Symmetry: D2
Subunit: 483 residues, 4 copies
Amino acid sequence: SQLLNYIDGNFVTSASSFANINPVNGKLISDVFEADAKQVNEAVVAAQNALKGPWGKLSVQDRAALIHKIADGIQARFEEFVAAEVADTGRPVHQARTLDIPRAIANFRTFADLAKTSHTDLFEMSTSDGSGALNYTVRKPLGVIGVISPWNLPLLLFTWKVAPALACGNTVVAKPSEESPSSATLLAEVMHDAGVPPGVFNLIHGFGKDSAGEFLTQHPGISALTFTGESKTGSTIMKAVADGVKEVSFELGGKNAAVVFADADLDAAIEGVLRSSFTNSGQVCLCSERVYVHRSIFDEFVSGLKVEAERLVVGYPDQDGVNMGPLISHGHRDKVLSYYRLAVDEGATVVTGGGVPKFNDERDQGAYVQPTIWTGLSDKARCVTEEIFGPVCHISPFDDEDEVINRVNDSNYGLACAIWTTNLSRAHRVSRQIHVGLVWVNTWYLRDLRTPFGGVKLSGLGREGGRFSMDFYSDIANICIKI
Amino acid sequence: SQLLNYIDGNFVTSASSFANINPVNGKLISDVFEADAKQVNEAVVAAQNALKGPWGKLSVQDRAALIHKIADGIQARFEEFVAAEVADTGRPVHQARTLDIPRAIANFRTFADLAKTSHTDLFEMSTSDGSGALNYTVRKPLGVIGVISPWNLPLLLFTWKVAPALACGNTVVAKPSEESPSSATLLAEVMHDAGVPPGVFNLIHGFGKDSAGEFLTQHPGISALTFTGESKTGSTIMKAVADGVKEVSFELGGKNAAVVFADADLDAAIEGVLRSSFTNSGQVCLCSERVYVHRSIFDEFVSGLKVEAERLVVGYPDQDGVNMGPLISHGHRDKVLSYYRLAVDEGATVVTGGGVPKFNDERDQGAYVQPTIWTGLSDKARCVTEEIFGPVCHISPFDDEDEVINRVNDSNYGLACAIWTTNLSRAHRVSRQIHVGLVWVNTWYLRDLRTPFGGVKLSGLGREGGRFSMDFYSDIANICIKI
Amino acid sequence: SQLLNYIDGNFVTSASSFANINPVNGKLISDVFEADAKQVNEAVVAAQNALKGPWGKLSVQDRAALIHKIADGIQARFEEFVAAEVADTGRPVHQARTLDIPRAIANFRTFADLAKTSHTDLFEMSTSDGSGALNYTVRKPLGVIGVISPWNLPLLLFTWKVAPALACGNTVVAKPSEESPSSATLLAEVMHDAGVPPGVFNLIHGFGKDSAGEFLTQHPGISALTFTGESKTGSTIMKAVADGVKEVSFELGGKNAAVVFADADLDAAIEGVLRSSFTNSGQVCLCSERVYVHRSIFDEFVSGLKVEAERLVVGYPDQDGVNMGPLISHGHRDKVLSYYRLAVDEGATVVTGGGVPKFNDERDQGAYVQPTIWTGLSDKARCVTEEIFGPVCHISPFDDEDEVINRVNDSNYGLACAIWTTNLSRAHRVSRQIHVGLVWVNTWYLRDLRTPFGGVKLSGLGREGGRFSMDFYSDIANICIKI
Amino acid sequence: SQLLNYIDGNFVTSASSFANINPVNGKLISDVFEADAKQVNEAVVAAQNALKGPWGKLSVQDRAALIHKIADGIQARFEEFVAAEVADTGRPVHQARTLDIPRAIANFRTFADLAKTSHTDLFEMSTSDGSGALNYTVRKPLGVIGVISPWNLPLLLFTWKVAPALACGNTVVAKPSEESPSSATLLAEVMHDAGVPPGVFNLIHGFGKDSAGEFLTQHPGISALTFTGESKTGSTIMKAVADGVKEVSFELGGKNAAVVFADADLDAAIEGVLRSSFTNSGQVCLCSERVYVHRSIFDEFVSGLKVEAERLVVGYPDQDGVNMGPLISHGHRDKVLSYYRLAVDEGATVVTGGGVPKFNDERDQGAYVQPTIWTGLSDKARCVTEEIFGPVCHISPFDDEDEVINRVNDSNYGLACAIWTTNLSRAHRVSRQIHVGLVWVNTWYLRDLRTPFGGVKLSGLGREGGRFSMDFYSDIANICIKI
Ligand SMILES: NC(=O)c1ccc[n+]([C@@H]2O[C@H](COP(=O)([O-])OP(=O)(O)OC[C@H]3O[C@@H](n4cnc5c(N)ncnc54)[C@H](O)[C@@H]3O)[C@@H](O)[C@H]2O)c1
Ligand SMILES: NC(=O)c1ccc[n+]([C@@H]2O[C@H](COP(=O)([O-])OP(=O)(O)OC[C@H]3O[C@@H](n4cnc5c(N)ncnc54)[C@H](O)[C@@H]3O)[C@@H](O)[C@H]2O)c1
Ligand SMILES: N/C(=C/C=C/C=O)C(=O)O
Ligand SMILES: N/C(=C/C=C/C=O)C(=O)O
Ligand code: NA
Ligand code: NA
Ligand code: NA
Ligand code: NA
């Protein structure tokens, strides 16, 4: 199996390739051709030229129809996209079938519909001469959008950027994660077969530093760079585009908290924290890695979570009641295990997990770790402050509302928080005080695609979702008519 | 000792001072105390802490009321602010009276009012269990806003950032331009006298690199950096805040065009382009330095503009009938003169101006240049592509509408453009094709503070004005309640 | 052929029927069963009950998909709908094919999309105890919407109401005009076949006074009455629902003007006024029956419009170059011809038309009239002030812009106006001074479904279109949470 | 004392007059001149003319500044306004000082501010020839607004209509209630002294049927009638305006419920129901005349409420700790006492009150009644279904959530509801099911002037508040420019 770049309407190979590895068993899935600087340039130039071709003359309604045809194309190959996402990442098949792929299709449909309904503003004004003036605003395409996406929710996060980019009449050069290149390449096929004009959507494979990603960010031809990934990489990209003053939108890390108050529905909180800590094997930027539980219910909470975490099934993506697959890769598992040892060194009690499961089959050649719960660390421990991106949480007691609010907010990140309480006042009082972009009360990762999505502090720059995406991916121009 | 910093509610001197010079005659106006790194830290820390004090507890209505008291405080000292702006910049007194100071007051009133009226969003959604969920958004203060402003419209541009910063509940550390420090110091006294709590507004004086401006951009304590000035500085600042992923908002250079079609009201277009080229001695980022005129009216337009340009009175701010003051400084004047020589070397015809007037009085020790009009340069000439920021324009003929739109858009900048035509279709057809943030038709620099304002390409990052300011200066947080 | 009512999911007959006549030739097309008071009650009760059934449990996404299925169902029978609308009204087949049916389809898709994208408002407030409160708004179904619709654009106007009613989660009882019952009945079949739950959409046939129309209007079980028709009929309905204080939305008559300024594109204005006067044989509420032309071009306009009007082909719906069909009915034609006589009596010059064409075939038993142009009437003549609703216009000269604005506005109606000018300022200066809900400049009846649509004075009550429809067909409820 | 009409900038008497009675003591406060049909016509004509005068040329900023001067003018006579509202209505001085007068002032400031920030829409569209079109909307004054208002919150409700009417550039003819004419007359003096141009605001005194109220509603020169009062009066007005198809906004009766769930904070709910039942002596449309309390806390609630109700001090507006003043008049007291008798006859148990207090002083000639609580009535009793508009409530037990929702909704009215509960899910789940315009959770009559305010069913037609006012009191016109 081979994964090509898609540049200016053609699938093309490159001089260099790399391996796509299945994290379940360590086996080779495919070879991937790495785009060089020359090919990146060729993509950017093609995307510039496509803005002046047929794509550029489509009405908003016709553009929207064509984006719906993209969505239809993915739906028509639904189970192929499921298989590609599962192979790259080891995610449970049921998750790919119910979240990953349908979200990617819904991304396209939501932004196609938003492109149809969206309008702009009219401002009347008086003038000295008494005849007045009119200011009106219009949305135009920004230009070429460079898209660089991560491996944790491959098609979902890729199409989260590509859908609004296209719905706003932009052209795109997109570089998916080297760990999860498959579903993006299938998306290129769907674009091609749906009649998307050449150069509108281009797909380049590769790495970051000294590869496709870097070259993309350095290219003077782009108008914007949208990115999801690690905070440090965000900082690096922000420096890279600075000489062009390119528009930027970043969704970066977090070290998210969950807070369980004494009035919580306890079993529901246990189940919710189980999901918020261990979904996708802890490899969602939204996962809870720090948990604060009121002292009066702390012991019972920890006990209850231990029992649920030990019933989790860790294994094959299509295994009967599977809850967790492996980590994305052996190198990622190295990092996570390194943090597992660090916690023990910082004085953690390992309530459960803390190692790798023994399967006695091919899974032992994969990148699995156990779901892990810690207790006993101070708020300043490295394991409680640095993003681990694995299936782990630390649980700490608290006593007072104002105290726990300060502890959640004592972080250089600020992406998301989940709070558990049955009390009306507390939900709204406490939520508004958490320094994050996204708070859930009595749930986790419930998404309405119209809402603003983003983080604060190190977790983000800007906001996407609904009209924020329509504003980010558009040139907003103001036209003033003196009457 | 004359202009002090204002930090945590006290005027404070510093270890060194620098001279503030009157560009009308080169005389010393005052000594300005240059904030050092420790003082910049103190200000940022004070601004951090003020977010937890009484300022953080004010209702939106009470905050708005206090901002209106700031406005009223400026108004109460109106003629002092006029004299300060005039002294620093040499602006004609009638212009500081009618444009600069009143706009600064209007900035505070508008954003105070937007703060009281602005609301957020409610999204209802269905869930699996049939009970639904609610997502709602709220605006909160972003944090500490660092404000770095230019010398060309000192109080106007400084308050354009400070007013929405404060209206959104933030605290501020603001660094005015070293060339025009006086009005911003008076503003500090107004804040003090209105009872703004300590730490909420802090003024620091100094330069950029290795001085107060650079220190502010590098401080990890700010949440955002808003800047107006040269594109090159914008790039430097973007790199500096990168490691912190600070929110950024930039209004940068342009090389703006005016276009005059054959069906323009010729007299009105001549007067309009005279204003657009020579207002504030050509020192507005919105000024036209490139003018394109349909060949049928080219000679008449040029002849007319020469006549009107040579009637401009260049002189004292309180001189009878004065139209233009000096440039901001001798250093700026040397840069503009360096372009006046370069234009001649690149082959220009000097229609008028091209040097410095000879006053035979103390004005010869100031920083005056003549209003200049060039003809005969090619589109790739440096004087037609690089921002000069003086009272100059090049006039070129054109023949076809698609041609002139290409020539307007063939620029690394994209701030603003002015079009002159009486034809309904052409106005709207042409305006939407110009790749800028702001187009005026049959006028120039008509401002409605509700409109989105900014540039594209090198001319900017983001938008401000109306709801775009309210969104930039706020954290937008989404709270999701499972029902 | 017989046309049944559709009540609670079943097609049902009634004790009485009335004839549906083809206005082309006077032949019987079908018998239509008239709903009595008991059946209207049954439809209302069914509609009330369906709000408590499955319909009321659908998510907005699922409701929207069902409404898209209605639209697809129309599209799948597109040519049957075309044939139906043509048979009832005599409209040219190509007009039914390009305007009427595609717009009915688009009505459904537009409002389905709006239902998915629309959201409500979140208002935060401070309280005396310092804890604050939240106000959030929600859109709920208003309840049972009664829809009464006219014969001039039967399916388009019927669906213009039914689509947002359904999209907002309401149930409907709809009474189409007795002159054009066929396409509505067909729509009831599409509804049935698409699986719309019983009682959600009910169709009742009949007349107004002393019939289905009036009974619907009097039923205490409805929550709103939306209506398009004669202003006098609006007034009657407003009286009828007053005791229940029902929500009302009315789009009523007009006596619309076109204004042609001296700088108009003359041949384009001639063609535009031809269309605005004689489309659908002048039977559109938006038609121009008053035309004002600048004195300097009056004679040449009148001359040119005469020639174009006499080239119109008046004939069979599928006849080769056909432009106009008959009037809707003999009764309407009696009324139009009465005005034709009145005009001559009031002193008109008949420039063209003024009678009935003579075909010497079966069309002579239909309801045809000639396209007619008058001159020479004063502004007070009844033929110039009262709505005729036939293919007629009166042309008068003017000299001065303010004068013609006054003469346009001197009316008890205020639906629409069309202005012809090539001048940028005039277009905007004049448009804003016309006291109507809709102005077109250099075009007529160009529709964007997001815009507010409606009239002033006797021409309307309320606005519909875009968010205006979403607000009218919803209960907007405010919920205030003390924190 | 005499109260004059204010018509075209002059105070004028009439041929007929009526007595304004102080309800504390039955003494004559003033004689009021009753406008006749000719005076009403004179006011409407003057309002129509003033739309073409200096008022119509004000910029939105200058109009807003003039509206703020009206507000300032009220504030400068603050104690006079307080004395006037007290004299007319008997309302406690403390509450006129803190609710009534301050709210009237805030109505003007809020709508003045909205007027300055409000803007309209721009819609871009494709056309067949590829050139496109623009639709933009503008807000214009609707015309002459007729304002008819009730006696319960005289200045607050009067200004709630007058402020947005004026802020939207309309002119006004206003008829305050015959029972509370004083503060409105004072307001005409403030308008006059603030320099409001003659004819912009006209005040006419009189009654409803066969008097100034009716004459206004029949006058063909008005563009809109906004009304607050009894439902049956709304129905009558809606018939009166029907032949002109005038725009109408009605805020009408309610029979509002409060619901106290078992998990409510009990003492807070008692205090809250006390306020919601007996504020302004129960003469607020928003008052709770029906209370439902969960069975498990019913007896304890009734007992607590009994105690609080008997601690209320009923007496002079300026008496020490007065809580309640008299009813508005003797005629209204006769109606309320009639209901107090009916309740006994319907089987009610009188927990407290039920008659009139005994003062043995001039208050015996007033219109006082006692705070009254009933128990024991069925859901169909007249006293539980009909609006009494006095200081009374009936308390009833309930068992189940769905049950109480059905019972609250089982009404021909639908204005407001208050719910008491500490539970997050319950609050949001139950609130959205209550068929009213306004739900308060854990509070009552908490007002944010931006929110939509209105009722459903017999309780109203339309919404006012924030943008809903700006939309009602403006003509929204759509201008379509073909490019
Ligand atoms: N887009 C707009 O709206 C707009 C408006 C006005 C001015 N401008 C641009 O502003 C320029 C005005 O000139 P200027 O010479 O004041 O610009 P500048 O960029 O040299 O200086 C602007 C400010 O930045 C500070 N500064 C300079 N170097 C810095 C550094 N390394 N770190 C941090 N702060 C630093 C300065 O002290 C000053 O306060 C022109 O380019 C003009 O077009 C743009
Ligand atoms: N927002 C609301 O829903 C709201 C608010 C406050 C009061 N109210 C209602 O107010 C009522 C108490 O007020 P009210 O007794 O003053 O009501 P009312 O209806 O008898 O009269 C109110 C106003 O209407 C005038 N009026 C009476 N009959 C008229 C007619 N035929 N034509 C024209 N005008 C006429 C009166 O002179 C007075 O100015 C209660 O029903 C209460 O629910 C409703
Ligand atoms: N649903 C989403 C999950 C995202 C995680 C990081 O963005 C999203 O981003 O849209
Ligand atoms: N505060 C208010 C009370 C209104 C009661 C009836 O309208 C209001 O209307 O603003
Ligand atoms: Na992989
Ligand atoms: Na200076
Ligand atoms: Na018919
Ligand atoms: Na009275």
